[PDB]
mmCIF file of N, CA and C in Angstrom:
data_model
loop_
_atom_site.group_PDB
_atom_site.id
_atom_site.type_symbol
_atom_site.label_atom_id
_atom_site.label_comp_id
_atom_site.label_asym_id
_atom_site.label_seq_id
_atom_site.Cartn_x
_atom_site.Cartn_y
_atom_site.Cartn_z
ATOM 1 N N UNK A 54 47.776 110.440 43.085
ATOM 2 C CA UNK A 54 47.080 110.978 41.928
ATOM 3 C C UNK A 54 46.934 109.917 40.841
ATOM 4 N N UNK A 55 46.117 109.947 40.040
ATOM 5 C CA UNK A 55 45.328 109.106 38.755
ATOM 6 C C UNK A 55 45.118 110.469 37.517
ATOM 7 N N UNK A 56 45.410 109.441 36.601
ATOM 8 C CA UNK A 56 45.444 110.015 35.587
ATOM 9 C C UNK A 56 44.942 109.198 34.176
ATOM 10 N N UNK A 57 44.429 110.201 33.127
ATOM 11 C CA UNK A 57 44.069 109.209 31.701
ATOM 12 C C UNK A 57 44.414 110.116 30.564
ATOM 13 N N UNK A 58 44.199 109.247 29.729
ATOM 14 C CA UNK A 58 44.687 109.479 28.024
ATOM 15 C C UNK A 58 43.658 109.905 27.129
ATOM 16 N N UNK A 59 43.966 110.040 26.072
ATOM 17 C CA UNK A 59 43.211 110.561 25.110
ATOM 18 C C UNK A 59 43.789 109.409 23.772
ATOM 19 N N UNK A 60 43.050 109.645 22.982
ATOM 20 C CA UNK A 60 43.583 108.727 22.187
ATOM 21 C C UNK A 60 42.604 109.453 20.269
ATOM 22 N N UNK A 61 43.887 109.817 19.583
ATOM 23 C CA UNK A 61 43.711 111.318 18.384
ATOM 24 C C UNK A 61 45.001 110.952 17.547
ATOM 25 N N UNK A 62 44.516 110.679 16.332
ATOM 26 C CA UNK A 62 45.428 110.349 15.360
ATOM 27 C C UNK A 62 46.737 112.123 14.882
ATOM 28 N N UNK A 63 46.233 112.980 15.346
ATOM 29 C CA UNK A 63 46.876 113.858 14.947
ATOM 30 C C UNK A 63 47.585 114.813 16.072
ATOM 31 N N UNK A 64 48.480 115.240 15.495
ATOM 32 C CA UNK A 64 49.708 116.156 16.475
ATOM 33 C C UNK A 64 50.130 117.722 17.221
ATOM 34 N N UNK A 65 48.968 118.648 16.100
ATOM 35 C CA UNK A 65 49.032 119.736 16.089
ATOM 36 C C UNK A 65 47.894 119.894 16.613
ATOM 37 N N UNK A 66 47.452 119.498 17.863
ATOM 38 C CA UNK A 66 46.639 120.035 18.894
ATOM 39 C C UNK A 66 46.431 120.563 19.878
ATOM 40 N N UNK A 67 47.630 120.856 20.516
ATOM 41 C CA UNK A 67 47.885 121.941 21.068
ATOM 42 C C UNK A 67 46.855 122.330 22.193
ATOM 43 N N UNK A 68 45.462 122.842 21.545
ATOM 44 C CA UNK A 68 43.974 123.500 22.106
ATOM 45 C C UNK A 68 43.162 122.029 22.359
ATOM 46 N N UNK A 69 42.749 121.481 23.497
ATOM 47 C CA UNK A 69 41.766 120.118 23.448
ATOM 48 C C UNK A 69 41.239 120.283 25.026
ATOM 49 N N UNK A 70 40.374 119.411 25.414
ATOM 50 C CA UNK A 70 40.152 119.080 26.538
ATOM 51 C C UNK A 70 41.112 118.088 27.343
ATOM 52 N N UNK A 71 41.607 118.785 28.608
ATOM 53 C CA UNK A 71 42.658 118.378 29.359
ATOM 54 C C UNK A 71 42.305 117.548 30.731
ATOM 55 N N UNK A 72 43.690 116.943 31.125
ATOM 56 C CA UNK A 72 42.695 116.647 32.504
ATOM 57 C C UNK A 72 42.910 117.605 33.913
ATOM 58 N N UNK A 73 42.960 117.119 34.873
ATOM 59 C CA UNK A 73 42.473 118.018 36.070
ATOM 60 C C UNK A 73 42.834 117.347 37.335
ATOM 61 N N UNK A 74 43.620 118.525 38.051
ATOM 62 C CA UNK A 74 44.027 118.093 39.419
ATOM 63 C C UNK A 74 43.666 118.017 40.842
ATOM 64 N N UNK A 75 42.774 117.390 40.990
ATOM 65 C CA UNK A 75 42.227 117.115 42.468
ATOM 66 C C UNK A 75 43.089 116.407 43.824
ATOM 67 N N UNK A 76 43.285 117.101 45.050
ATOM 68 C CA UNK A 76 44.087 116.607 46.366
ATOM 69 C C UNK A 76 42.894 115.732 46.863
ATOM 70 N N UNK A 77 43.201 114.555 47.669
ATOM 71 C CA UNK A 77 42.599 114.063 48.303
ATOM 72 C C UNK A 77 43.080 114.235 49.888
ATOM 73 N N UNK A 78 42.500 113.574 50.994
ATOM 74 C CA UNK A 78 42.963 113.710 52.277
ATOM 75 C C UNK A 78 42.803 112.754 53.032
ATOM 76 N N UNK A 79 43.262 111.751 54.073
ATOM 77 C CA UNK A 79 43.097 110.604 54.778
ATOM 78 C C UNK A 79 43.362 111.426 56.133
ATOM 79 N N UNK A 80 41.998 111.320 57.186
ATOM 80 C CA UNK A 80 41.855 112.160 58.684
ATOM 81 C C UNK A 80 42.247 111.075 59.670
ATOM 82 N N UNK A 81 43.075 111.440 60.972
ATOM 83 C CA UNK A 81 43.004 110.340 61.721
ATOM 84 C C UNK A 81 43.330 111.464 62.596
ATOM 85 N N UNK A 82 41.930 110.556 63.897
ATOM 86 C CA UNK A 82 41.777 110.845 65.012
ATOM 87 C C UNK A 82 42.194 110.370 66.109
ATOM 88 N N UNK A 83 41.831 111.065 67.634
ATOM 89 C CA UNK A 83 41.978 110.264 68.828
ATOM 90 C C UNK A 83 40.563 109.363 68.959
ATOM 91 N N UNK A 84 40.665 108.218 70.129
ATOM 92 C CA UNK A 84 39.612 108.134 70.763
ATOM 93 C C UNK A 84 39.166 108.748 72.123
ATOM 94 N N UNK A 85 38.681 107.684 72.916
ATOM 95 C CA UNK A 85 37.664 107.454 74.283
ATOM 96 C C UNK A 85 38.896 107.371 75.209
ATOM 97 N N UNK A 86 38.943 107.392 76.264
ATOM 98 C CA UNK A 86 39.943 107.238 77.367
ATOM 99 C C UNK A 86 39.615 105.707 77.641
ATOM 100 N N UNK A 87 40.841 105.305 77.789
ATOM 101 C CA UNK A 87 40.729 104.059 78.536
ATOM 102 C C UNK A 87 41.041 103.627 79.792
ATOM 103 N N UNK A 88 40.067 103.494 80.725
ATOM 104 C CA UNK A 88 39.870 103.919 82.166
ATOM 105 C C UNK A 88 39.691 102.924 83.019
ATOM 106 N N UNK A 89 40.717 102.557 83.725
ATOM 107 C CA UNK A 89 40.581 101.395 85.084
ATOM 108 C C UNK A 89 40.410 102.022 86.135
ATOM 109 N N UNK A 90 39.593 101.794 87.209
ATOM 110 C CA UNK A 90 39.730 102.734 88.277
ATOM 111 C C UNK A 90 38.799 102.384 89.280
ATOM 112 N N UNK A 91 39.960 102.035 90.867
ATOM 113 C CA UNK A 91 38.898 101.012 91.977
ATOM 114 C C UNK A 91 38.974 101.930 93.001
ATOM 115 N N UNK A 92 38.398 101.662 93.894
ATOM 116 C CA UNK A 92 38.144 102.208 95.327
ATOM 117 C C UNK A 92 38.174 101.195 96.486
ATOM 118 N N UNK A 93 39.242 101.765 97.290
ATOM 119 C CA UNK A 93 39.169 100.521 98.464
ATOM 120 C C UNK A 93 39.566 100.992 99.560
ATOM 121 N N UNK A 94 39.684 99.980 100.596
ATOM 122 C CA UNK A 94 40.774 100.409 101.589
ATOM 123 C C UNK A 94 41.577 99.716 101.990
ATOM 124 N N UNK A 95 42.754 101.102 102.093
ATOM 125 C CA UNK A 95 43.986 100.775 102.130
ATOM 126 C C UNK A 95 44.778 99.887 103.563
ATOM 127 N N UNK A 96 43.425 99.765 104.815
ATOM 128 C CA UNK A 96 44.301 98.634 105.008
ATOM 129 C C UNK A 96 43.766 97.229 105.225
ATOM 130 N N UNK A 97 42.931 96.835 104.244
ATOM 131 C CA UNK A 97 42.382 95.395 104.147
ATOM 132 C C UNK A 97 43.139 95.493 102.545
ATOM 133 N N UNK A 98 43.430 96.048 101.775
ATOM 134 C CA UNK A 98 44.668 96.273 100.911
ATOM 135 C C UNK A 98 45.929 95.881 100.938
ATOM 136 N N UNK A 99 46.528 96.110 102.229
ATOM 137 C CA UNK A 99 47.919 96.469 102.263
ATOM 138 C C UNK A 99 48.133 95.494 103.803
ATOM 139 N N UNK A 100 46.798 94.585 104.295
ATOM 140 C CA UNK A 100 46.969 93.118 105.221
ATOM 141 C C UNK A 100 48.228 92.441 103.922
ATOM 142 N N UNK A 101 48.207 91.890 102.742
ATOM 143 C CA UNK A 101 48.999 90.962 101.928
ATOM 144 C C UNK A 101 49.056 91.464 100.930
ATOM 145 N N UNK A 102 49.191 93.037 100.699
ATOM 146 C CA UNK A 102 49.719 93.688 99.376
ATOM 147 C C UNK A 102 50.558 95.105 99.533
ATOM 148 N N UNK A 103 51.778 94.826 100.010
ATOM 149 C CA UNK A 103 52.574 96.122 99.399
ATOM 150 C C UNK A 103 52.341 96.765 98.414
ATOM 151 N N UNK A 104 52.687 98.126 98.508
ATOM 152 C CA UNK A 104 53.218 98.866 97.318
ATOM 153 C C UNK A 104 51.749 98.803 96.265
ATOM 154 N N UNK A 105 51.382 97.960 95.961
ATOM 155 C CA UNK A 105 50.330 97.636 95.622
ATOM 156 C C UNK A 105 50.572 96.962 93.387
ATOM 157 N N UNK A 106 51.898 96.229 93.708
ATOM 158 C CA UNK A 106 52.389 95.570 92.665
ATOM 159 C C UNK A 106 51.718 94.504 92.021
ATOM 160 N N UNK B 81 16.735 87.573 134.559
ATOM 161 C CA UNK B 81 17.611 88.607 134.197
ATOM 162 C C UNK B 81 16.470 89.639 134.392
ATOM 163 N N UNK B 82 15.816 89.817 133.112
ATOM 164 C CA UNK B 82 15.059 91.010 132.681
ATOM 165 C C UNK B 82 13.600 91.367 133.471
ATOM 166 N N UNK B 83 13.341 89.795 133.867
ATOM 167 C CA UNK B 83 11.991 90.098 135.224
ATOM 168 C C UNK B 83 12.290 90.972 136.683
ATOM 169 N N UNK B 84 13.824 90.438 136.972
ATOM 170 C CA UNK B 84 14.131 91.179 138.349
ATOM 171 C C UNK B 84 14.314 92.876 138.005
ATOM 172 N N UNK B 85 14.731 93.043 136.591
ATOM 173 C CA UNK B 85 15.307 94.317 136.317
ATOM 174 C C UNK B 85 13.488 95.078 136.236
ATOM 175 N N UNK B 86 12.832 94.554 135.522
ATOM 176 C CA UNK B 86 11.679 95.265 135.733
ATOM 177 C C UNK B 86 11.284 95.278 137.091
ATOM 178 N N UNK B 87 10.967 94.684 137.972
ATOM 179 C CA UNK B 87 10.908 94.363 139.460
ATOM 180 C C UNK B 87 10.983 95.755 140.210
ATOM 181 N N UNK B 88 12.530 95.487 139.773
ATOM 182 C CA UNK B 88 13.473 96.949 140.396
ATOM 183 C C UNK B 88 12.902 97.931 139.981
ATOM 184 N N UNK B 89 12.714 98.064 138.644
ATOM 185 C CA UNK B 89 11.757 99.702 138.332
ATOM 186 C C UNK B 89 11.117 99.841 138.173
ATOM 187 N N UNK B 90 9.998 98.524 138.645
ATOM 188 C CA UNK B 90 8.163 98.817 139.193
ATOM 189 C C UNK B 90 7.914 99.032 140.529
ATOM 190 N N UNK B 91 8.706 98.590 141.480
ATOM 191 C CA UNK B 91 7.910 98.618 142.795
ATOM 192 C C UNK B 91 8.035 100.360 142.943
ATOM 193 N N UNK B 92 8.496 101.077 142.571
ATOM 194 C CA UNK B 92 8.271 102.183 143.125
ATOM 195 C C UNK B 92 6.854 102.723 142.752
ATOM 196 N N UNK B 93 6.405 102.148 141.776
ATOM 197 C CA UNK B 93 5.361 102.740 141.433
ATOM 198 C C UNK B 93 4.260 102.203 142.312
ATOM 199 N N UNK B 94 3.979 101.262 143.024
ATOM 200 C CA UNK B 94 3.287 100.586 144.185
ATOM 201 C C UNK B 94 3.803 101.091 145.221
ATOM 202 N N UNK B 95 5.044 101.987 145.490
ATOM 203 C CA UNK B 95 5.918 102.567 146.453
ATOM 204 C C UNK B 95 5.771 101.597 147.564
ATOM 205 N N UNK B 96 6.857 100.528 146.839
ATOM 206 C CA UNK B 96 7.520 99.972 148.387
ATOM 207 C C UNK B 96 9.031 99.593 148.036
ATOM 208 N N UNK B 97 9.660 99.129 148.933
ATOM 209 C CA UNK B 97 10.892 98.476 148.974
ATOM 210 C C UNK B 97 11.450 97.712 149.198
ATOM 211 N N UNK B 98 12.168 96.796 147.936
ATOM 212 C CA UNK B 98 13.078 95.678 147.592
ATOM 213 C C UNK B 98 13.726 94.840 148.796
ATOM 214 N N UNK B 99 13.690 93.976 148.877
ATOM 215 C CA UNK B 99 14.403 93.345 150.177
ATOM 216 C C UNK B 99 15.492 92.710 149.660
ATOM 217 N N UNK B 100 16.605 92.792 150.614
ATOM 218 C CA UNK B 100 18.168 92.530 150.566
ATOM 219 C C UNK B 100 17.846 90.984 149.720
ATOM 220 N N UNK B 101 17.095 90.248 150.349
ATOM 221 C CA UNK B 101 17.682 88.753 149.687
ATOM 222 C C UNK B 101 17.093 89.241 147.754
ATOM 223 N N UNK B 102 16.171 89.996 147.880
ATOM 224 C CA UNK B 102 15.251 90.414 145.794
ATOM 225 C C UNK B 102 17.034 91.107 145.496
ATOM 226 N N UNK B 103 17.667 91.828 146.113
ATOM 227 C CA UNK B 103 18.481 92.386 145.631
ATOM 228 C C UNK B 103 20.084 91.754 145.347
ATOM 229 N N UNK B 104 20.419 90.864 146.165
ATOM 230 C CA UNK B 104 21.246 89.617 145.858
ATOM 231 C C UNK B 104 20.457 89.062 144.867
ATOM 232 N N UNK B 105 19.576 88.352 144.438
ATOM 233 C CA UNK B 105 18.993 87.435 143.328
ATOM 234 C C UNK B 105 19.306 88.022 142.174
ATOM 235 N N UNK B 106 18.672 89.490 141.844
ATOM 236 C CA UNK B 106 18.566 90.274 141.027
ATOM 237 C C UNK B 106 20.666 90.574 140.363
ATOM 238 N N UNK B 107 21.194 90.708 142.106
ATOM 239 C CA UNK B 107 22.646 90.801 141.499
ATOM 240 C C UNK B 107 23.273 89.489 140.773
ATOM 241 N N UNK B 108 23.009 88.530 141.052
ATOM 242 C CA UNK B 108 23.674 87.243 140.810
ATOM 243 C C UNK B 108 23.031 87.434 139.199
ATOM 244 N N UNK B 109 21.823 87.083 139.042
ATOM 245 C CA UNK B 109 21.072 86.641 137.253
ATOM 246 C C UNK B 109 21.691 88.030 136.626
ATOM 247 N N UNK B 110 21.841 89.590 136.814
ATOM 248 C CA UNK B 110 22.609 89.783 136.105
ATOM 249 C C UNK B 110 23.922 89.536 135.772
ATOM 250 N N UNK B 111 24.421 89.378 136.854
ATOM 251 C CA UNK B 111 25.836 88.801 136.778
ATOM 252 C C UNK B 111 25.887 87.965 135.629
ATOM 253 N N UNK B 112 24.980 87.218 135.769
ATOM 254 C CA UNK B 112 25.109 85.492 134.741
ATOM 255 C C UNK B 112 24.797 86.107 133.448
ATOM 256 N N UNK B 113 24.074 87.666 133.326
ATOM 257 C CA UNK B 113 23.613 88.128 132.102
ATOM 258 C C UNK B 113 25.113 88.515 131.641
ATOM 259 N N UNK B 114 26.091 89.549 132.568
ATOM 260 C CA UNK B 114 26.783 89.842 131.784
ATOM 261 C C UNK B 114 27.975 88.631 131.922
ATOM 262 N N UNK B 115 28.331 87.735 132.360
ATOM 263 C CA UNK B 115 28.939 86.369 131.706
ATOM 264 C C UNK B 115 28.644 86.062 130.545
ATOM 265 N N UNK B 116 27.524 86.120 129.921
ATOM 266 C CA UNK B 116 26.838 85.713 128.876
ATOM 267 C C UNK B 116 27.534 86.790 127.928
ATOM 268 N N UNK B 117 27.514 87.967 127.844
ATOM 269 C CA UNK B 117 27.237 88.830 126.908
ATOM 270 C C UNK B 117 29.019 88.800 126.759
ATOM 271 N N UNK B 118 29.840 88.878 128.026
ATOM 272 C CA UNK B 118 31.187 89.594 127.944
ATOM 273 C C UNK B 118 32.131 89.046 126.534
ATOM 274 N N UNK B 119 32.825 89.885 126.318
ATOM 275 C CA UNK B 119 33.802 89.946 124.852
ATOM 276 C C UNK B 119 34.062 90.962 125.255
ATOM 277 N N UNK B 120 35.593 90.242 125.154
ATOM 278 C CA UNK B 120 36.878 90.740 125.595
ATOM 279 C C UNK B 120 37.937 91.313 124.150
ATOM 280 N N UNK B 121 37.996 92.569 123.747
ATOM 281 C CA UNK B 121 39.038 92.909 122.193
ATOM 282 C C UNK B 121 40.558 92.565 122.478
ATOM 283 N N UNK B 122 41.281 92.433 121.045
ATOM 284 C CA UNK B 122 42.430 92.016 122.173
ATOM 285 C C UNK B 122 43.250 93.345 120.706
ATOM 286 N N UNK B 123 44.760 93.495 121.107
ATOM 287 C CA UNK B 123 45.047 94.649 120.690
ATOM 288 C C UNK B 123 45.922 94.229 119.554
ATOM 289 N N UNK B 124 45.942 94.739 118.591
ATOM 290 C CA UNK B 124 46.883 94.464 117.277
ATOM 291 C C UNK B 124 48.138 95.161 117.463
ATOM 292 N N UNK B 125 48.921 95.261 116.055
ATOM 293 C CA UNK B 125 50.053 95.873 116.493
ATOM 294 C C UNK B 125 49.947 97.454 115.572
ATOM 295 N N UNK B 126 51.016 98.164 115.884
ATOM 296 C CA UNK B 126 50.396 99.548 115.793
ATOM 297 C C UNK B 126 50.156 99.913 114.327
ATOM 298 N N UNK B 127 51.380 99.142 113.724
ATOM 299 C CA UNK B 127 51.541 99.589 112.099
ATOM 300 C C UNK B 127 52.913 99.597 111.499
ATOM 301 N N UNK B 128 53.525 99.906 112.560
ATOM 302 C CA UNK B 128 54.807 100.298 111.535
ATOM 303 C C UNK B 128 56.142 99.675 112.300
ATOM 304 N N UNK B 129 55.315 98.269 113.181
ATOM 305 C CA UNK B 129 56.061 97.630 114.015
ATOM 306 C C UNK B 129 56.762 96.543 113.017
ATOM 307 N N UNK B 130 58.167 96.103 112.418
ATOM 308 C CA UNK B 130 58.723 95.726 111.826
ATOM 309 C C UNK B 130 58.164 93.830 112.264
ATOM 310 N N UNK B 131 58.139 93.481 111.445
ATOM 311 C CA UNK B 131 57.680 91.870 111.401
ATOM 312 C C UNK B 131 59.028 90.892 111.019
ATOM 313 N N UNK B 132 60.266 91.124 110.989
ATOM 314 C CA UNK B 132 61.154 90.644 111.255
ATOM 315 C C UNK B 132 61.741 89.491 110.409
ATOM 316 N N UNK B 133 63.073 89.406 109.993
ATOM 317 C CA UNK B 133 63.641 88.512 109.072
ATOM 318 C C UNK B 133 63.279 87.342 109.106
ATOM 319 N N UNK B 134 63.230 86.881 110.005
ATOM 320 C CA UNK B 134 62.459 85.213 110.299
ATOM 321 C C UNK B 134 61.145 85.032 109.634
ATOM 322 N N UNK B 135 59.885 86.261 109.528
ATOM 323 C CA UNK B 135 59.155 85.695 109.018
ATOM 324 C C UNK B 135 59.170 85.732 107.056
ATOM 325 N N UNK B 136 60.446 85.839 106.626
ATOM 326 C CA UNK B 136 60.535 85.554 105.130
ATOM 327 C C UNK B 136 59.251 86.564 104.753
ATOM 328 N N UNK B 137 59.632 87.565 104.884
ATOM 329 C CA UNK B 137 58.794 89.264 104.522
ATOM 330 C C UNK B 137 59.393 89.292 102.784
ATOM 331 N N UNK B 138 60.447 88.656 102.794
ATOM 332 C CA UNK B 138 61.094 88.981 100.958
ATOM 333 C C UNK B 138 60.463 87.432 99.780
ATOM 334 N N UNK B 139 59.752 86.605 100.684
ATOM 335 C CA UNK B 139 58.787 85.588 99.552
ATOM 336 C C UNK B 139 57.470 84.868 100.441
ATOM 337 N N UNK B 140 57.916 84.426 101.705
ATOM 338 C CA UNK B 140 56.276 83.917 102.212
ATOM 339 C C UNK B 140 55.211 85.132 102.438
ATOM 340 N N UNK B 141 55.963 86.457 102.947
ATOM 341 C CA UNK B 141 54.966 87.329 103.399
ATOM 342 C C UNK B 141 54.876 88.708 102.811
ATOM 343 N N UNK B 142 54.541 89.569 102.497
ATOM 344 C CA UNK B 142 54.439 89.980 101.473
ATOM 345 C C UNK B 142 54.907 92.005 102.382
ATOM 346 N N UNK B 143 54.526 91.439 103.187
ATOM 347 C CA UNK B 143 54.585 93.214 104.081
ATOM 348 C C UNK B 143 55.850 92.969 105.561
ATOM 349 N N UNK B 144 56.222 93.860 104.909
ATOM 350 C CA UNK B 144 57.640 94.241 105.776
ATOM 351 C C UNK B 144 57.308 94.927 107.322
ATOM 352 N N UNK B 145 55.757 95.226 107.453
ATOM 353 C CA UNK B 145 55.264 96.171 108.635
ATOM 354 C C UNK B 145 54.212 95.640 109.062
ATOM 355 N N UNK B 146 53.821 95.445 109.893
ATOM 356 C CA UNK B 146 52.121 95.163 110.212
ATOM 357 C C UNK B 146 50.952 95.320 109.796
ATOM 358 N N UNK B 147 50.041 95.100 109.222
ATOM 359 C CA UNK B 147 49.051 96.306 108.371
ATOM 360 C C UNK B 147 48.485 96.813 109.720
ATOM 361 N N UNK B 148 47.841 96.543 111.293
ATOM 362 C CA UNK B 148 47.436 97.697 111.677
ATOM 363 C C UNK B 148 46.029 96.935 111.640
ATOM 364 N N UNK B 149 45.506 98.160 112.543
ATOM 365 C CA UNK B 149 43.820 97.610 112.725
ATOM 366 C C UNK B 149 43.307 97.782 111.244
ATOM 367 N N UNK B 150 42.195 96.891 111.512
ATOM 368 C CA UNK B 150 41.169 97.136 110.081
ATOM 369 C C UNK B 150 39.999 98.314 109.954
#
């Protein structure tokens, strides 16, 4: 919050124009998927790759 | 090859018949056809036939099993 002054030589004012309280809000979202994804076969794959590490 | 083979399945249509020596000739040039053509597969191993401590399966080779036909 922010705020300001007034600036009035006198004390007994009591009644004036005031200030005013406004909320603000900061939104946070998801994104997009992040997607690797192959097709093969598994045994020209798995000739010199186990497990597939 | 392919002249004697037609040979063989034209004369009937002139209806006559092949003589022993057309039919030796005809056997031999295919013969030599399939010399030509033959390929022979040879057999892999099944898959799950263990490839053995000697061949260093834990850093030169990477699979503990055979991979198996392609």
């Amino acid at each position: 919050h922010q705020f300001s002054s007034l600036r009035t030589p006198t004390g007994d004012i009591s009644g004036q124009n005031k200030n005013n309280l406004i909320s603000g809000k900061a939104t946070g979202r998801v994104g997009n998927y992040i997607t690797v994804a192959v097709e093969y076969q598994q045994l020209e794959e798995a000739i010199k790759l186990n497990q597939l590490e | 090859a392919v002249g004697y083979q037609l040979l063989l399945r034209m004369l009937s249509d002139y209806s006559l018949e092949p003589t022993p020596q057309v039919l030796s000739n005809a056997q031999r040039s295919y013969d030599a056809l399939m010399t030509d053509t033959l390929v022979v597969p040879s057999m892999r191993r099944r898959g799950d036939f263990p490839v053995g401590q000697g061949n260093k399966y834990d850093v030169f080779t990477s699979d503990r099993y055979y991979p198996g036909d392609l």
